Amino acid sequence: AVTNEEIKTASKIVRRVSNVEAFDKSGSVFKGYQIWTDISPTIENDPNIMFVKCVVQQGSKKEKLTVVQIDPPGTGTPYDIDPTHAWNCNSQVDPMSFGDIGLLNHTNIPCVLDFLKHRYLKNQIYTTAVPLIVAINPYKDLGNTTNEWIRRYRDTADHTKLPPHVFTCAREALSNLHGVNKSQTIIVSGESGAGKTEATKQIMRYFASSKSGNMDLRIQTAIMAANPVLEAFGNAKTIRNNNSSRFGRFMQLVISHEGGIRYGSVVAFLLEKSRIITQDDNERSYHIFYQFLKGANSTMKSKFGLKGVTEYKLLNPNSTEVSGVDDVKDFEEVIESLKNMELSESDIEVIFSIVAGILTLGNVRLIEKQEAGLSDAAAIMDEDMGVFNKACELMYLDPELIKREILIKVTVAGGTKIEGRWNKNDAEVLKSSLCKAMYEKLFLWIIRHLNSRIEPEGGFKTFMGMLDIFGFEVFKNNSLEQLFINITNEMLQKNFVDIVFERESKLYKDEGISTAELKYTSNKEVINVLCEKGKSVLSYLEDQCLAPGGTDEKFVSSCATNLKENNKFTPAKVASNKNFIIQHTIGPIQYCAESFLLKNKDVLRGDLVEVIKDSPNPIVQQLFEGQVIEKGKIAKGSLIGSQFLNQLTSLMNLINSTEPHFIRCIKPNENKKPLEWCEPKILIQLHALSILEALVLRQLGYSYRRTFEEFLYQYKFVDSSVENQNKCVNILKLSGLSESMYKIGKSMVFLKQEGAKILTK
Ligand SMILES: Nc1ncnc2c1ncn2[C@@H]1O[C@H](COP(=O)(O)OP(=O)(O)O)[C@@H](O)[C@H]1O
Ligand code: VO4
Ligand SMILES: [Mg+2]
16 A cells, blocks of 8 residues: 555656757657656546556647557557656666666666566566665565575676676675675665665675585574574564564674685664553564464473463554464474573573563553552552563562562662652553563674674674664654654665765865765655754753653653754644654655653663572573662663663664675565565656665766876876876877766866776777
């Protein structure tokens, strides 16, 4: 389904640069000119398609062109349109012959759509946008990922012979890393479900493909067997995709030339704790629960006291079975994938005992009481007490101590303590927060246990970076988690434009700036409205959290007044008290605030942490390990969002250092169906992944760039301080290039996409 909002957002992107020169010099009009048009009942009746192909009929003027619809099959009726609505077509070409869009004569919106389409439906998804690699999602296994296809890339000697691929950007990066001994990073970008995880899995498998049979299994073995476990605990079924990464994945990898992983680092960030507690309908919790509850052996089941996937209140009993997902099979895989991380039969037994714990604690009914002369007072339900006692046993903590930290408010004046009781609402809020913590920190501990065996003896010098972020998400409900997810993405988009469209624009201005006709990404306007310390959505949520009386509406009002003067922040038209639109790269995204404060405050702290700290089980002790208690008033550092900004900014800054290798995934249709083309949903991504500009300004702009000394070296016969500047201009005028093809800069020689190719004989 394509929203009329997705239709609007895509219709804005529609731009007409080049003119339709479709008339024979004399007259009679050019004989059968293929063009594109926004006008046709075939565009009106269909939302999936935006343009039809037409043949320019003989006897039309440059005011109204009589055109007949060729593709899609037209009623054969010639209709008249203004040249304003006619784009130049890449008349008679074979989209399969060349694996780079750069070779296209015209690279207008309709032409890139038809080019990527005539490939996607032909089952060639990957194309080079230069630098970028556009990798569409065909939803079906193509088999162009296999060890056979891996070998074919790594071992094949010539780099030009190699067609566009994920493996193309894997060798491209691995070669530079070993050759120029500079640490390189692979950026995976697109929608939440466009192909990030898949490409990341593929490129990992590629670096795990060894030529030599010498290297130690241990490190590589554990790293690859981490991916299935990481997904069990870190991925869940969504309305957008049935395996959505609810954590941002980052890797640092030491891979020796002969395709072997010597060392690695696994860092996951920002887990979705609101997954474990509740799930949207049609949506689900983290795979692990389901896999466990199903494929658990007779004994585990009885020992833990496991029930059905329906019988656990934390897990939605309607959305339990995933369309085309066999949870028992994946569980079996997840169990071996754990052993293959140096986790013993006991270590596993514990992981699942805690998991069984979280579930069992989430079935405990808390109730209201008139108790201790407090009323509204927290008290565990009489019957559900047995549940709670095993629930704690399973987590390996004292039940009556967890019972004491929930149900009892503990305050301090001076060096002296004051008792008091927790209320039903707040006790339930705390009971939930215990589960959230246990889960988040167990996953984090498994990541820590993996890193303790895989990380380098010393540290990381030159490594291979890989980023499996959570892509842009749009629904009906858009919470703080959904806001964080879209903030993360916006950073990975400015990271890109600063490297791809800014270093360029600077170098032109530093030498010979040809066009003021360049980049289209005003990501700075939206990255500031969201992160800029003091004045931003996050900074007015940060301040509001540490405020005494801080309401969700109080935070909304501060943005609706302070950030008003900006176009990127738009307040809601209806229910303006709660909702607000943030005009993203992918377009207008609206957030219903509500709980925003408590969600940013959703982090376990206090004397409660200390209970888990001195647990009998060591894994449970280690579960928190490095934790600053404070037991009271919250800090700026302890805030969920405020920690995330620090986390993203720090990690992103390491990436800006390493060599950027961009992979751009496109989701062709929401329908989760192979070989289905929805032009508007795609067009939005062509704009956001900046693909339709990263070719407009690469082909229109100068692509060579070499200093006088570099240029004059290839023409050996010549050799000089200001004279060698004029020496280069000669070689060019002699070779045959027009004064438009080349440009002479303050220190270098710029040569166009087409020009630079001439001098290569
Ligand atoms: N190149 C591909 N070939 C086949 N299926 C793919 C491909 N890329 C993605 N998919 C499918 O699309 C699903 C959603 O993509 P996913 O791996 O979760 O990436 P992301 O991190 O963007 O969500 C995958 O689980 C897989 O079924
Ligand atoms: O769907 V994602 O794995 O990109 O979050
Ligand atoms: Mg993922």
